[PDB]
Antibody
Framework: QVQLVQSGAEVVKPGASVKLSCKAS????????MYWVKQAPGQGLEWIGE????????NFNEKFKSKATLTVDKSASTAYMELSSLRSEDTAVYYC???????????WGQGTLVTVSSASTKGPSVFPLAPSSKSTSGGTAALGCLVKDYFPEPVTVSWNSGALTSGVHTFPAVLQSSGLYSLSSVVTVPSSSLGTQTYICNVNHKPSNTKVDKKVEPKSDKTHT | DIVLTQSPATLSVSPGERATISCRAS??????????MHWYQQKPGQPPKLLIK???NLESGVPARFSGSGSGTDFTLTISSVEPEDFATYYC?????X???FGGGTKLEIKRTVAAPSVFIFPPSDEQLKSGTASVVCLLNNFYPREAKVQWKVDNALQSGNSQESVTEQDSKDSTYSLSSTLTLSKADYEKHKVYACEVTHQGLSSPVTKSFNR
């Protein structure tokens, strides 16, 4: 199976540089060109340039020739893109993508969000949104995780290490008054089986190297003091 | 450089209807034998995925309902019968002359049947209350269309601030939206009141739905 796996999102200070990576597996790295592509959210994609991994030769979009530097590491099957002297216009998702012959782009990395900012990275806190068989709608229960107070974007959430995907809604982040982001991820499940099924949210915030797993259980008190 | 202009910007289609989207190149992108236009599908949060190469060749693994046509400057992508999973932004890209460029995308929206939300309310976690803040969450699940009003009431009083909402994109399996509304208070503020409620209005409901709890 062909895969391209990119490095994690990062915050970068204005004027600093950043180096992005793209590891190729499942094919002969030197047999395909590697492209890099920029996308500001919801915009047409823009081609940055190309490297030939067999010899290091590069070609650039004139618009990016002063911004990007492309290299490879053979033994690591990895392509690198260094972006210089970052400014706000550089905040975007960056993709690597392979091309057999400089026509179509047939396999893509997952993208790396680069946020240009003077603010410090912060990892989130994770809180349960607990279900109850006493709080149902149509016999279904809802549960989730609240992922609060992080910077920059993004957070990703999986459930049960990716085994639970049906009925999952991971909301777009909101920007809080603090300048930190928050999101929730929720799931609806049978109300009959909250005592037998296990629901764990797996939260990742790559800018801060945060991974949190949180087991979400129905809450256990008749005593109010 | 060659400019690709896609139309429409957003295409709205009922479940199972045909969708046709257009890409026009600012100059010819075909030889006398082949057309150098390619189509991609970008699902929410994902990279683009190649669907059609050289105007009309379906990429291996791509569903048979996708087809492409055209030559010269004017190209089309057709989905014969739209499925929920086809919710995406679609992009064209040429490889005629350098540099390759992309169109601005067409968003495909799906006009599924009306569905009322299912509503859930969540008190703050004990763990969060230990840190001095209380987030109360109201979930509106699996509704259509998007328009919805959520109001917070604390001891029956309409709250004028301190909440934030987020809505999902259309769901990949059923084309509905979901919405979260989070009321955030200091622990001390939280503890000065008794009843927390969210009141939801949506066209699939004939009266507002209220979910509540007592702290």
């Amino acid at each position: 199976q062909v895969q391209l796996v990119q490095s994690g999102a990062e915050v970068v200070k204005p004027g600093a540089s950043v180096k992005l990576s793209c590891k190729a597996s499942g094919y002969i790295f030197t047999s395909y060109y590697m492209y890099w592509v920029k996308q500001a959210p919801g915009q047409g994609l823009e081609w940055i340039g190309e490297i030939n991994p067999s010899n290091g030769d590069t070609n650039f979009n004139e618009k990016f020739k002063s911004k990007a530097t492309l290299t490879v590491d053979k033994s690591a099957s990895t392509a690198y893109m260094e972006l210089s002297s970052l400014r706000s216009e550089d905040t975007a998702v960056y993709y690597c993508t392979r091309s057999d012959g400089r026509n179509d782009m047939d396999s893509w990395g997952q993208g790396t969000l680069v946020t240009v900012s003077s603010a410090s990275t912060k990892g989130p806190s994770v809180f349960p949104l607990a279900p109850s068989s006493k709080s149902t709608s149509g016999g279904t229960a809802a549960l989730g995780c609240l992922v609060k107070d992080y910077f920059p974007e993004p957070v990703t959430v999986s459930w049960n290490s990716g085994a639970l995907t049906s009925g999952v809604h991971t909301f777009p982040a909101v920007l809080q008054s603090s300048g930190l982001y928050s999101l929730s991820s929720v799931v609806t499940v049978p109300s009959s089986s909250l005592g037998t099924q296990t629901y764990i949210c797996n939260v990742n915030h790559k800018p801060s190297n945060t991974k949190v797993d949180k087991k979400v259980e129905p809450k256990s008190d008749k005593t109010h003091t | 450089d060659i400019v690709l202009t896609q139309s429409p910007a957003t295409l709205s289609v009922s479940p199972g209807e045909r969708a046709t989207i257009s890409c026009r190149a600012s100059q010819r992108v075909s030889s006398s034998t082949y057309s150098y236009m390619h189509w991609y599908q970008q699902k929410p949060g994902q990279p683009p995925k190649l669907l059609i190469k050289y105007a009309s060749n379906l990429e291996s693994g791509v569903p048979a309902r996708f087809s492409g046509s055209g030559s010269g400057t004017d190209f089309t992508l057709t989905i014969s019968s739209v499925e929920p999973e086809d919710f995406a932004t679609y992009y064209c890209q040429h490889s005629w002359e350098x540099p390759p460029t992309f169109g601005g995308g067409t968003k495909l929206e799906i006009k599924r049947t009306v569905a009322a939300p299912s509503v859930f309310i969540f008190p703050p976690s004990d763990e969060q209350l230990k840190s001095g803040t209380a987030s109360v969450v109201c979930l509106l699940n699996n509704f259509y269309p998007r328009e919805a009003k959520v109001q917070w009431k604390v001891d029956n009083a309409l709250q004028s601030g301190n909440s934030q909402e987020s809505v999902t994109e259309q769901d990949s399996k059923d084309s509905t939206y979901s919405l979260s509304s989070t009321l955030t208070l200091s622990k001390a503020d939280y503890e000065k009141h008794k009843v927390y409620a969210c009141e939801v209005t949506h066209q699939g409901l004939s009266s507002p739905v209220t979910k509540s709890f007592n702290r």
